[PDB]
A paper describes a structure:
His-D4/A201–50-WT as well as His-D4/A201–50-T2A (carrying a Thr to Ala point mutation at position 2) crystallized at pH 8.7 in space group P3121 with unit-cell parameters a = b = 92.6, c = 145.9 Å. Diffraction data were collected up to 1.85 Å for His-D4/A201–50-T2A and to 2.2 Å for the wild type complex. The structure of A201–50-WT is almost identical to the one of A201–50-T2A: the effect of the mutation is strictly local and affects only the mutated residue. Two His-D4/A201–50 complexes are present per asymmetric unit. A201–50 forms two α-helices that are packed against each other. The contact is strikingly flat with the exception of the prominent residue Trp43 of A20 sandwiched between Pro173 and Arg167 of D4. The contact surface is formed essentially by hydrophobic residues, but 6 hydrogen bonds confer the required specificity to the interaction. On the D4 side of the interface, Arg167 and Pro173 contribute to the interface whereas Ile197, Val200, Leu201 and Leu204 are the main hydrophobic contributors and Thr175, Thr176, Arg193 and Ser194 are the partners involved in hydrogen bond formation. Most importantly, the structure identifies a second contact in the D4/A20 complex, involving A20 Trp43 stacked between D4 Arg167 and Pro173.
Author numbering:
A (entry chain B): -2 to 218
B (entry chain D): 0 to 50
Write the structure that this text describes.
Amino acid sequence: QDPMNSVTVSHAPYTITYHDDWEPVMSQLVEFYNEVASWLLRDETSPIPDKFFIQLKQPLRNKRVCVCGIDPYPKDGTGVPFESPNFTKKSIKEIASSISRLTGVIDYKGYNLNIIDGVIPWNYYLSCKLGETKSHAIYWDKISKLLLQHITKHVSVLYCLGKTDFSNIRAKLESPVTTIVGYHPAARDRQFEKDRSFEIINVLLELDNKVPINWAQGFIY
Amino acid sequence: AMTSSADLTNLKELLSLYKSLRFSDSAAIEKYNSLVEWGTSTYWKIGVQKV
């Protein structure tokens, strides 16, 4: 409530609370959201409208990696990308077993990309109609570009999960940023299991004289 | 491919060569420049340049 600001929009959730690092985009976010939100709000969503924007509370200046999925869990999104508080969603379980395999940590009760220093977990579209991936693509589009471009000014590496969903990601950005497009954790044939993105991200970081990501900070005991 | 062991292997060799930067033949310097190009092209932007 000091590095946190808020702005008023014309549709639910009505207030957007954001960390200072997001300021330069807030003005256009408000205009973009007001023109589409009523269309959006016609359906029940994952996450609920009160949670659409809670990731804007995160600092950007301390981030070196954005881990990005296309949109929220079709059900039970919390507004924090990939978060599954009771460790029940498949993607987060799979990501966690990659990190287990990678780091040698074998007993754990949870994993959350949002508690890892230097990481910002991100959803490209900020909602979907309950049960239906990508159903709100057409509404989010201009916002999604606005927000991901802003993010990519701060991070050294953008990692996107979903070969098909992200095959055109470059077009969506202005200035180049180190970009990795890996398999979705649900991809056929355990391809996600063979995907070495988490380690590749860290070599890329060292090549940009940055500190590698300490993936084990993700675990919950 | 971006995501395989072999991408990881090439990125690690490029980092190693970047750390010494001390090339003693044409081979080596060429390996380094050609890894930079491959990395740049595969991941769009990387932190090191051709020398």
